[PDB]
Paper text:
Xeroderma pigmentosum type B ([name]) gene encodes a superfamily 2 (SF2) DNA helicase conserved from archaea to human (1–8). [name] plays a key role in DNA opening at damage sites and coordinating damage incision by nucleases. An XPG-like nuclease, named [name], has been reported to form a heterodimer with [name] in many archaea. Furthermore, [name] and [name] nuclease have been reported to work together to unwind and cleave DNA substrates resembling NER intermediate DNA structures.
The crystal structure was determined to 3.0 Å resolution by molecular replacement combined with anomalous data obtained from an isomorphous crystal of AfXPB complexed with a Se-Met derivative AfBax1. There are two copies of the AfXPB–[name] heterodimer in the asymmetry unit forming a heart-shape. The two AfBax1 molecules interact with each other through the C-termini, particularly, the β-strand loop β-strand (βLβ) C-terminal tails forming two pairs of anti-paralleled β-strands. The two AfXPB molecules remain the open conformation observed in the AfXPB crystal structure. The AfXPB–[name] complex structure reveals that AfBax1 exclusively interacts with the C-terminal half [name] including the ThM and HD2. The crystal structure of the AfXPB–[name] complex reveals that AfBax1 consists of four domains: the N-terminal domain (NTD), a central domain (CRD), the nuclease (NUS) domain and the C-terminal domain (CTD). The NTD is mainly responsible for the interactions with [name]: the β-hairpin and the first tri-helix bundle (α1–3) interact with the ThM domain of [name] while the second tri-helix bundle (α4–6) interacts with the HD2 of [name]. In contrast, AfBax1 reduces the ATPase activity of AfXPB by 50% instead because the AfXPB–[name] heterodimer keeps AfXPB in the open conformation and hinder AfXPB from forming the closed conformation required for ATP binding as the C-terminal half of AfXPB collides with the CRD and NUS domains of AfBax1 when the closed conformation of AfXPB is docked onto the complex structure. Interestingly, the inhibitory effect of AfBax1 on the [name] ATPase activity is removed by Y-shaped or bubbled DNA substrates, which allow the AfXPB–[name] complex to have higher ATPase activity than AfXPB alone, suggesting these NER intermediate DNA substrates activate the AfXPB–[name] complex, in agreement with its role in nucleotide excision repair.
Author numbering:
A (entry chain B): 1 to 467
B (entry chain A): 3 to 445
The structure:
Amino acid sequence: MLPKELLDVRRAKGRIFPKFADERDYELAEKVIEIFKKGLGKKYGNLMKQARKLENAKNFKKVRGFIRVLENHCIEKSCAFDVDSELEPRKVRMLLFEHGFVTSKKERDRVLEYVARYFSTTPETVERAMYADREEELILTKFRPLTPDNLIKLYNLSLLQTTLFNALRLTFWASDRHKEIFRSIKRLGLMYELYEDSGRLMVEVTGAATLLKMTRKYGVSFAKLIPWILRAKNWFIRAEISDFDRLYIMEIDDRIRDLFPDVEERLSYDSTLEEEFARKMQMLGYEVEREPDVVKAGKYAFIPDFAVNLGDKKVYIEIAGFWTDEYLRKKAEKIKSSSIPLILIAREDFGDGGANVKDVILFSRKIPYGEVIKALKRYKPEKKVEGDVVELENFAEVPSEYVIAGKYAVRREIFEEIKREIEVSNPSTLEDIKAILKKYGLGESAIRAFGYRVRWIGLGEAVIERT
Amino acid sequence: MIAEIYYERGTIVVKGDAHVPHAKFDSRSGTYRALAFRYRDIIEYFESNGIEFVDNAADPIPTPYFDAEISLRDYQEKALERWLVDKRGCIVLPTGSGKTHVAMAAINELSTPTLIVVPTLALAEQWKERLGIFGEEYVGEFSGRIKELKPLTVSTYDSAYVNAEKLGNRFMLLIFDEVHHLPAESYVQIAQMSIAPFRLGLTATFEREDGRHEILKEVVGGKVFELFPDSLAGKHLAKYTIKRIFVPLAEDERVEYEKREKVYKQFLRARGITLRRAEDFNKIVMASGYDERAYEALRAWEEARRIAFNSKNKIRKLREILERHRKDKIIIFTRHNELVYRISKVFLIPAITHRTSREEREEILEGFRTGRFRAIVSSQVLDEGIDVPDANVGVIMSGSGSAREYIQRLGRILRPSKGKKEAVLYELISRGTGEVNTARRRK
Ligand SMILES: [Cl-]
Ligand SMILES: [Cl-]
């Protein structure tokens, strides 16, 4: 949220620690809030200007970071503005832009006088109205008060999460709130790998943030995970950030919980990227029983998203969004090693196209609910070791269905030889095809495949006898 | 009582400082001297460690400001960028007009006295014909046939070698065509004896030829970009060229810039730091902290960069480009929102910033998709998320490689116009104010 240029960090030998703000900084934060409070009716750019005159050599990194964060909050959440014009700026500018583009003062005046005539006004009023709904030209009407502790805590949260936006990968641990933090990971859909290592009963989680493709898209959802993390009672976070020749490492702790705002579960204005788990659990509900609300893991830890109920065992499925070739190969070798079902379906139209997986891969498109359904229908429940069904197969147990047939199966080559022998020998009788076929593997109910149907052409029907 | 360097017979002799690098004391002379090609390292020493000095070594041939708009292919532009990092090093290219063009663009950009050096007098005539684009007034040849000292002089290794002394201190840019000829013990004296800070070698060979590629890095610099014909014959040639325009600062703008320029530059060399990229000054001033005048430095630098990007001249140059393309579709791109809105106000072009709503964003792009708006100015459209409608012409106000990849992305969406062969991606680069040199009336 806070720009990487205006980043106030201490540069250590091999570490990096964000110089957070605290109650030592109350007095300032109050001063920058007061001129927004006292400057209602003032052009929002002029308040921005005043707030930045409070800038000097010692405070500039944070008095600027304050103005930025308050600005965002005021704009996005806690303020209401008036446009200082009688004209709607979108209307003015679209009529202007619809009259071509101008490359001279003369034709520029022509279109202005043309638009001014339309809006029953002067050209200067049209030139003012054009971008009058720009933040800095807006008139501040309602600023709701912020307590300077609030602003400081926000500054620390954005300053924390903008450092993390620039990092390559980060690993943390949380005491409480595993499930909803997990659910936040999945809807955000960043590539993960959870490990029960360097600890006991402690799930350690890792995730990358500095990618080659779509680096900002998931760079901006990566920092959207951190308030859920900071929402537990205890957490130990370390990250690996680098843009130099070498890397720096930071580590923040739950003892800094007093520096960041309290944020209960927001959970608003979305389907939570669970399009399939919410609508196509119903498409799969017609075929088998399913449970989108799943929590599972094996010897190592993998986050499922859906579950397929088979009687012998269940099939886990994961529907994460983000992916990369090098980043998928690690998560993929684990699913086969532990022999866990772990059905995986990615977005082949959103990420970059590299080399699809040899054994287990799923592609996606505009409507890919089938492209992965082709590989997924092959749940393959314990299909690696299969015995011979030629004989045995509970023969002692029950021969109730053991009346089908008697002996071995024919070979395609031999089958092709008998077919070739049958196409040319010219049979027309049952007693004529029976002898040609009895020479090699006799059997009556064995003209199943030769295209012949035996037919009693006489008067009446075919009799039977007891054996 | 002041340090001074002067030029003599292919060497620089320095008087007034003894820590000057690569200098060696000639007991016969009583003064320190080094090979003339140590010019940079010596000039760098005096300005990094703040020793004021006189320069009686350099006597450049007066050279204008070249604003030829040399059209480059994408990978040729890529080649130019990688060279300009050091402005000293070597390139290999598949074709030979590609080599020249890159050399042609670099000469255009640097606008200093330039000496091309080729093996044969046939090539010498081909270079100097190609260099006609900058005006034959400024092209010349210095070989056996004729000896004339123009801003763009072409010569052969053979005649340059015989004349390494008289040619040492008179050009700022040094171009070697088929550069692998240079490592002969005679031809290296050409390089070793000219003060020319900027050095470009053009070739197509490999890095395993008798181990003499070792002496190149010392005297011209090592490879910065490689592309052999086989990597060209496997990919389709993109349908657009990337021309570079050089826009001077106006006089008053150059007045104020040099002010703020002096304060930040004086503070940085007072520190004596070597900044890799100017963006690291946004961050070096924060992490180091513990400094009162570093704010005043940042404030001047920030003030300086702002004077440079809002150049009144760059919008006038954009005005000229727009008249030139009244019939085509155009996407202008900078990274500065104030400039995006300024371009929009001046030329009545739809703007798309990150503060633009998804409604008006999609309106603009659909109206650019149809014929409703012939142009867009924007700082977002080159993002990986949204797909831009096709266009015939791109402009990059920024010109710089802060975000180099944008030049690639802006090319991706360009397509030739009905009636023309290929598209164009201008890029506007802020260079000088005037007053480069004299009229070459000496001798
Ligand atoms: Cl000597
Ligand atoms: Cl002189």
